[PDB]
Paper text:
ALSV belongs to the distinct Jingmenvirus group within the Flaviviridae family with segmented RNA genomes. While segments 2 and 4 of the ALSV genome encode the VP1–VP3 proteins of unknown origin, segments 1 and 3 encode the NS2b–NS3 and NS5 proteins, which are related to Flavivirus nonstructural proteins, suggesting an evolutionary link between segmented and unsegmented viruses within the Flaviviridae family. Here, the enzymatic activity of the ALSV NS3-like helicase (NS3-Hel) was characterized and its crystal structure was determined to 2.9 Å resolution. ALSV NS3-Hel exhibits an ATPase activity that is comparable to those measured for Flavivirus NS3 helicases.
D1 and D2 are tandem RecA-like domains with an α/β fold. The proteolytic products were present in the crystals and their proportion was clearly increased in comparison with the sample before crystallization. This result indicates that the missing C-terminal portion of the D3 domain might be owing to proteolytic cleavage that occurred during purification despite the presence of a high concentration of proteinase inhibitor (see Section 2). All conserved SF2 helicase motifs are located in the cleft formed between the D1 and D2 domains. We found that the residues involved in the recognition of NTP, hydrolysis intermediates, catalytic water and metal ion are invariant in ALSV NS3-Hel, which suggests that the catalytic mechanism underlying ATP hydrolysis is conserved in the NS3-Hels from segmented viruses. While most of the catalytic residues of ALSV NS3-Hel superimpose well with their equivalents in ZIKV NS3, the P-loop of ALSV NS3-Hel adopts a different conformation.
Residue numbers in the entry: 338 to 398, 406 to 472, 480 to 576, 582 to 735
């Protein structure tokens, strides 16, 4: 019926087996079904796992079942009716991702599916009434290093022979930076280090797929979020709202973050998971750090569209008062999708959604720095 139905699916489960059955059960009452997942690789995985299902079309930026990503579905539902329709059901995978677009998308699918006179449903599936699924296809062994991540990867390199291994590191730089640890692993273990960041994902990813015999060590930021073990810093590089703007800080990753970083190893093979002893899984934030700037941009959009908002910190509530985009400023952001920050979209799109002059664009961003200093306008 017109209902939203969560399904707690463990990370990398035999979802493939189950999603084609959900699409045909939704062809009961509705005429199209949209399938979306965070990154493109999941969208291709979903496309693969629907191979034998007749009228299936992809949307990677007539038909009856579209698969695409969270982002470019949002970009589409907003530009082409869709939400005014009553015969479109949705299936969303990895609803627990830390993107503002997933958040607003979830709200809009919820609105158009529980709508009055609706004849469509939604199926949400996540690895996170407070529950986090830590099951996998194969068993996973949880261990604890007390002495640092590099040295626990040395212990592993010698106690075990070469394996495929991966290290989840907060930032590209720092004393625990991807660059910094890869050099130290390079110079100790016989493993070859493949660094993966958004800054370098596209070039090195190719390198990741060869069979490395002396050993392979993926040192990765959260973009990566097939191998035999995972070493977790249990730390991330959020940007956070600080009441003068935003600042970049290292944080204990959220329960949902580590649940996905772990969920990389148990899918096709036994795997081991190494977290630091001094990490409070019980006590870290479940889904989002209380005042992360992703929770600001999501609520900013949700308020303009007069949708239900998300639990957030006090510094965000404060910031949602200094910064109040209009329905169309957040449409232009969500639909032309060439400004990473909603804050900067407010500089280039007027209150009515039209493009601003060059001198108007520059006046507004300087005025905005008087009260909100977004530190993402640099790096």
């Amino acid at each position: 019926a017109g209902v939203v139905l969560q399904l707690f699916s463990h990370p990398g489960a035999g979802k493939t087996r189950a999603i084609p059955e959900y699409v045909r059960q939704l062809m009961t009452w509705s005429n199209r079904v949209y399938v979306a997942g965070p990154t493109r690789v999941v969208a291709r995985e979903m496309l693969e796992s629907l191979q034998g299902t007749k009228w299936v079309c992809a949307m990677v930026k007539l038909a009856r079942v579209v698969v695409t990503t969270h982002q470019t579905l949002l970009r589409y539902a907003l530009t082409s009716g869709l939400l005014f329709a009553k015969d479109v059901s949705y299936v969303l995978d990895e609803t627990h991702v830390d993107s503002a677009h997933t958040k607003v998308l979830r709200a809009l699918i919820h609105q158009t599916v529980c709508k009055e006179k609706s004849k469509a449903a939604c199926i949400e599936m996540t690895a996170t009434e407070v529950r986090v699924s830590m099951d996998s296809n194969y068993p996973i062994v949880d261990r604890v290093y007390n002495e640092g991540v590099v040295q626990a990867v040395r212990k592993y390199a010698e106690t075990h022979g070469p394996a495929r291994v991966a290290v989840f590191v907060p930032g590209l730089t720092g004393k625990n930076g991807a660059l910094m640890v890869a050099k130290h692993i390079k110079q100790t273990t016989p493993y070859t280090t493949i660094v993966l960041s958004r800054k370098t994902y596209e070039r090195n990813i190719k390198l990741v797929f060869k069979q490395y015999p002396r050993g392979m060590c993926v040192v990765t930021t959260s973009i990566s979020e097939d191998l035999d073990a995972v070493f977790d810093t249990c730390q991330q590089y959020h940007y956070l709202v600080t009441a003068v703007g935003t600042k970049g800080v290292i944080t204990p990753s959220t329960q949902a973050q580590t649940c996905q970083r772990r969920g990389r190893i148990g899918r096709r093979r036994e795997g081991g998971y190494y977290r630091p002893a001094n990490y409070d899984i019980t006590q870290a934030p479940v889904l989002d750090h209380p005042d992360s700037v992703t929770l600001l941009e999501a609520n900013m959009c949700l308020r303009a569209l007069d949708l239900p908002e998300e639990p957030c910190g006090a510094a965000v509530q404060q910031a949602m008062l200094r910064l109040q985009p209009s329905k169309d400023q957040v449409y232009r952001w969500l639909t032309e999708q060439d400004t990473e920050t909603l804050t900067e979209a407010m500089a280039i799109y007027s209150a009515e959604g039209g493009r601003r002059s060059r001198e108007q664009e520059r006046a507004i961003r300087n005025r905005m720095r008087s009260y909100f200093n977004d530190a993402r306008w640099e790096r």
